[PDB]
Write a protein that binds this DNA or RNA. Structure first.
Length: 178
DNA sequence: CTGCCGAAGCGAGCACTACTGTCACACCTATTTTAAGCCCTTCAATCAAATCATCTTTTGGTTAGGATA
Protein backbone atom coordinates (compact mmCIF):
# COMPACT_ATOMS: atom_id res chain seq x y z
CA UNK A 1 0.00 0.00 0.00
CA UNK A 2 0.91 3.69 0.00
CA UNK A 3 3.96 4.65 2.07
CA UNK A 4 2.23 7.80 3.34
CA UNK A 5 4.05 10.09 0.87
CA UNK A 6 2.11 11.44 -2.12
CA UNK A 7 3.75 12.52 -5.41
CA UNK A 8 3.75 16.33 -5.46
CA UNK A 9 3.51 17.92 -8.89
CA UNK A 10 6.35 20.32 -9.69
CA UNK A 11 5.46 21.61 -13.17
CA UNK A 12 2.64 21.96 -15.68
CA UNK A 13 2.87 22.55 -19.44
CA UNK A 14 -0.05 23.90 -21.48
CA UNK A 15 -0.74 25.65 -24.77
CA UNK A 16 -3.65 27.56 -26.30
CA UNK A 17 -4.36 29.07 -29.72
CA UNK A 18 -4.77 32.85 -29.65
CA UNK A 19 -6.62 32.81 -32.97
CA UNK A 20 -5.10 35.91 -34.55
CA UNK A 21 -1.98 37.42 -36.05
CA UNK A 22 0.25 39.38 -33.68
CA UNK A 23 3.27 41.63 -34.12
CA UNK A 24 6.07 40.74 -31.70
CA UNK A 25 7.68 44.15 -32.23
CA UNK A 26 4.40 45.84 -31.26
CA UNK A 27 4.17 43.73 -28.10
CA UNK A 28 7.75 44.60 -27.16
CA UNK A 29 6.93 48.27 -27.85
CA UNK A 30 3.74 48.40 -25.75
CA UNK A 31 3.57 45.66 -23.10
CA UNK A 32 5.34 46.25 -19.78
CA UNK A 33 6.48 42.62 -20.09
CA UNK A 34 8.14 41.40 -23.28
CA UNK A 35 11.25 40.27 -25.10
CA UNK A 36 12.15 40.67 -28.72
CA UNK A 37 15.70 39.51 -29.44
CA UNK A 38 15.42 38.47 -33.11
CA UNK A 39 19.22 38.31 -33.34
CA UNK A 40 18.89 35.25 -31.07
CA UNK A 41 15.23 34.27 -31.47
CA UNK A 42 12.11 36.07 -32.75
CA UNK A 43 9.68 35.51 -29.89
CA UNK A 44 8.21 37.02 -26.72
CA UNK A 45 8.26 35.23 -23.35
CA UNK A 46 5.89 36.15 -20.49
CA UNK A 47 5.78 35.23 -16.83
CA UNK A 48 3.48 35.94 -13.89
CA UNK A 49 3.53 34.92 -10.22
CA UNK A 50 -0.20 34.31 -9.60
CA UNK A 51 -0.05 31.63 -10.98
CA UNK A 52 3.75 31.17 -10.94
CA UNK A 53 4.29 30.50 -14.63
CA UNK A 54 6.16 31.45 -17.80
CA UNK A 55 4.51 31.81 -21.20
CA UNK A 56 5.84 32.35 -24.69
CA UNK A 57 4.12 34.01 -27.65
CA UNK A 58 4.70 34.10 -31.41
CA UNK A 59 3.48 36.18 -34.32
CA UNK A 60 1.72 33.01 -35.55
CA UNK A 61 -0.95 33.27 -32.83
CA UNK A 62 0.04 30.35 -30.58
CA UNK A 63 0.73 30.40 -26.85
CA UNK A 64 2.86 28.00 -24.81
CA UNK A 65 2.73 28.32 -21.03
CA UNK A 66 4.45 26.42 -18.24
CA UNK A 67 5.41 26.62 -14.59
CA UNK A 68 2.26 26.05 -12.55
CA UNK A 69 1.86 23.40 -9.86
CA UNK A 70 -1.65 22.41 -11.04
CA UNK A 71 -3.33 22.14 -14.43
CA UNK A 72 -6.15 24.48 -13.44
CA UNK A 73 -3.58 27.01 -12.24
CA UNK A 74 -1.87 26.73 -15.62
CA UNK A 75 -5.19 27.42 -17.35
CA UNK A 76 -5.74 30.43 -15.09
CA UNK A 77 -2.35 31.87 -16.04
CA UNK A 78 -3.14 31.15 -19.70
CA UNK A 79 -6.38 33.13 -19.45
CA UNK A 80 -4.47 35.93 -17.71
CA UNK A 81 -2.09 36.25 -20.66
CA UNK A 82 -5.10 36.06 -22.98
CA UNK A 83 -6.61 39.03 -21.12
CA UNK A 84 -3.28 40.87 -21.32
CA UNK A 85 -3.08 40.37 -25.08
CA UNK A 86 -6.73 41.37 -25.50
CA UNK A 87 -6.03 44.64 -23.69
CA UNK A 88 -2.76 44.97 -25.64
CA UNK A 89 -4.95 45.88 -28.62
CA UNK A 90 -4.98 42.42 -30.23
CA UNK A 91 -8.24 40.47 -30.82
CA UNK A 92 -7.03 37.46 -28.85
CA UNK A 93 -9.20 34.46 -28.01
CA UNK A 94 -8.72 31.56 -25.59
CA UNK A 95 -9.27 28.74 -28.09
CA UNK A 96 -8.13 25.10 -28.07
CA UNK A 97 -6.51 24.92 -24.66
CA UNK A 98 -4.35 21.79 -24.44
CA UNK A 99 -2.23 20.40 -21.60
CA UNK A 100 1.12 19.04 -22.79
CA UNK A 101 3.22 17.80 -19.86
CA UNK A 102 3.76 17.95 -16.11
CA UNK A 103 6.53 17.00 -13.68
CA UNK A 104 6.22 15.44 -10.24
CA UNK A 105 8.47 14.01 -7.54
CA UNK A 106 8.26 11.79 -4.46
CA UNK A 107 10.41 9.81 -2.03
CA UNK A 108 10.51 6.42 -0.32
CA UNK A 109 12.83 7.20 2.64
CA UNK A 110 15.12 4.21 2.13
CA UNK A 111 18.37 3.84 0.18
CA UNK A 112 18.26 2.48 -3.37
CA UNK A 113 20.94 0.13 -4.72
CA UNK A 114 20.80 0.88 -8.44
CA UNK A 115 22.90 -2.17 -9.33
CA UNK A 116 20.16 -4.66 -8.47
CA UNK A 117 17.58 -2.60 -10.35
CA UNK A 118 19.67 -2.55 -13.51
CA UNK A 119 20.52 -6.24 -13.12
CA UNK A 120 16.81 -7.16 -12.91
CA UNK A 121 15.32 -4.43 -15.13
CA UNK A 122 17.93 -3.62 -17.80
CA UNK A 123 15.38 -4.23 -20.57
CA UNK A 124 13.62 -0.97 -19.59
CA UNK A 125 16.06 0.59 -17.07
CA UNK A 126 19.20 2.31 -18.37
CA UNK A 127 21.97 2.66 -15.79
CA UNK A 128 25.07 4.72 -16.54
CA UNK A 129 26.84 6.20 -13.49
CA UNK A 130 29.50 8.03 -15.53
CA UNK A 131 27.59 11.02 -16.96
CA UNK A 132 24.14 11.11 -15.34
CA UNK A 133 24.38 10.24 -11.62
CA UNK A 134 20.91 8.66 -11.43
CA UNK A 135 19.14 5.77 -13.13
CA UNK A 136 16.77 6.16 -16.09
CA UNK A 137 13.59 4.08 -16.41
CA UNK A 138 10.97 4.43 -19.16
CA UNK A 139 7.50 3.12 -18.27
CA UNK A 140 4.87 2.03 -20.79
CA UNK A 141 1.63 2.16 -18.75
CA UNK A 142 1.20 5.13 -18.99
CA UNK A 143 3.87 6.73 -21.22
CA UNK A 144 6.03 7.88 -18.31
CA UNK A 145 9.79 8.41 -17.98
CA UNK A 146 11.19 7.97 -14.47
CA UNK A 147 14.43 9.01 -12.76
CA UNK A 148 15.58 7.11 -9.67
CA UNK A 149 18.38 7.94 -7.23
CA UNK A 150 20.11 6.32 -4.27
CA UNK A 151 18.51 8.75 -1.81
CA UNK A 152 15.11 7.24 -2.66
CA UNK A 153 13.63 10.33 -4.31
CA UNK A 154 12.05 9.81 -7.73
CA UNK A 155 11.16 12.27 -10.51
CA UNK A 156 8.19 11.50 -12.77
CA UNK A 157 7.40 13.08 -16.13
CA UNK A 158 5.57 12.45 -19.38
CA UNK A 159 2.00 12.24 -18.07
CA UNK A 160 -1.07 14.36 -18.78
CA UNK A 161 -2.86 14.18 -15.39
CA UNK A 162 -1.92 13.71 -11.75
CA UNK A 163 -3.79 10.39 -11.73
CA UNK A 164 -1.19 8.97 -14.12
CA UNK A 165 1.59 10.15 -11.80
CA UNK A 166 -0.03 8.51 -8.76
CA UNK A 167 -0.73 5.28 -10.63
CA UNK A 168 2.82 5.03 -11.98
CA UNK A 169 4.10 5.76 -8.46
CA UNK A 170 2.15 2.87 -6.96
CA UNK A 171 3.11 0.63 -9.90
CA UNK A 172 6.81 1.20 -9.22
CA UNK A 173 6.60 1.25 -5.40
CA UNK A 174 6.71 -2.56 -4.95
CA UNK A 175 9.71 -2.66 -7.28
CA UNK A 176 11.44 0.02 -5.21
CA UNK A 177 10.70 -1.86 -1.99
CA UNK A 178 12.07 -5.10 -3.45
C1' DC B 1 72.20 -1.07 -118.28
C1' DT B 2 68.64 -3.50 -114.15
C1' DG B 3 67.45 -7.63 -110.69
C1' DC B 4 67.43 -12.43 -108.02
C1' DC B 5 68.40 -14.82 -103.64
C1' DG B 6 71.73 -16.11 -99.75
C1' DA B 7 73.91 -15.49 -94.17
C1' DA B 8 73.31 -13.86 -90.14
C1' DG B 9 70.67 -12.01 -86.43
C1' DC B 10 65.92 -10.85 -84.33
C1' DG B 11 61.67 -13.36 -82.88
C1' DA B 12 58.49 -17.80 -81.15
C1' DG B 13 56.86 -22.97 -78.76
C1' DC B 14 57.89 -27.71 -75.34
C1' DA B 15 60.63 -30.99 -70.57
C1' DC B 16 56.91 -39.41 -66.74
C1' DT B 17 41.21 8.56 -54.90
C1' DA B 18 38.49 16.14 -57.22
C1' DC B 19 35.39 19.15 -57.30
C1' DT B 20 30.52 21.48 -57.98
C1' DG B 21 24.96 22.17 -58.70
C1' DT B 22 20.96 21.20 -55.26
C1' DC B 23 18.01 21.08 -50.93
C1' DA B 24 15.95 19.72 -46.93
C1' DC B 25 16.79 18.45 -43.01
C1' DA B 26 19.58 17.99 -40.07
C1' DC B 27 22.16 21.35 -37.50
C1' DC B 28 20.72 25.38 -34.37
C1' DT B 29 18.29 27.44 -29.29
C1' DA B 30 13.29 30.99 -27.20
C1' DT B 31 11.99 28.39 -21.62
C1' DT B 32 9.69 24.85 -17.21
C1' DT B 33 10.20 21.51 -13.71
C1' DT B 34 12.94 18.45 -10.76
C1' DA B 35 16.73 14.57 -8.02
C1' DA B 36 21.15 13.43 -6.86
C1' DG B 37 25.52 14.02 -8.20
C1' DC B 38 28.99 18.43 -11.31
C1' DC B 39 33.90 21.42 -13.36
C1' DC B 40 36.48 25.71 -12.11
C1' DT B 41 37.28 29.77 -8.63
C1' DT B 42 37.46 32.32 -3.79
C1' DC B 43 37.83 33.27 0.97
C1' DA B 44 37.73 31.56 5.83
C1' DA B 45 38.51 28.27 9.67
C1' DT B 46 41.52 24.95 10.97
C1' DC B 47 45.61 22.80 10.69
C1' DA B 48 50.77 21.76 11.00
C1' DA B 49 55.99 22.94 9.37
C1' DA B 50 59.46 26.08 10.60
C1' DT B 51 61.52 29.57 13.52
C1' DC B 52 62.52 32.13 18.01
C1' DA B 53 63.20 32.18 23.53
C1' DT B 54 64.47 30.11 27.04
C1' DC B 55 65.71 25.86 30.24
C1' DT B 56 68.96 22.76 30.38
C1' DT B 57 73.38 18.75 28.98
C1' DT B 58 77.61 19.17 28.18
C1' DT B 59 82.78 21.45 26.47
C1' DG B 60 86.71 24.79 27.82
C1' DG B 61 88.45 27.73 31.92
C1' DT B 62 88.01 30.07 37.14
C1' DT B 63 86.85 29.24 42.25
C1' DA B 64 88.20 27.82 47.14
C1' DG B 65 85.14 22.28 48.62
C1' DG B 66 89.16 19.49 47.35
C1' DA B 67 94.30 16.94 46.43
C1' DT B 68 98.90 14.81 44.85
C1' DA B 69 103.27 15.78 43.25
Amino acid sequence: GPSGIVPQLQNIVSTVNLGCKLDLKTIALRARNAEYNPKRFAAVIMRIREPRTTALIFSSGKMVCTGAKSEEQSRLAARKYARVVQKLGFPAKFLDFKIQNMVGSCDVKFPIRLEGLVLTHQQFSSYEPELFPGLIYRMIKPRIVLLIFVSGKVVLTGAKVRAEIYEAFENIYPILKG
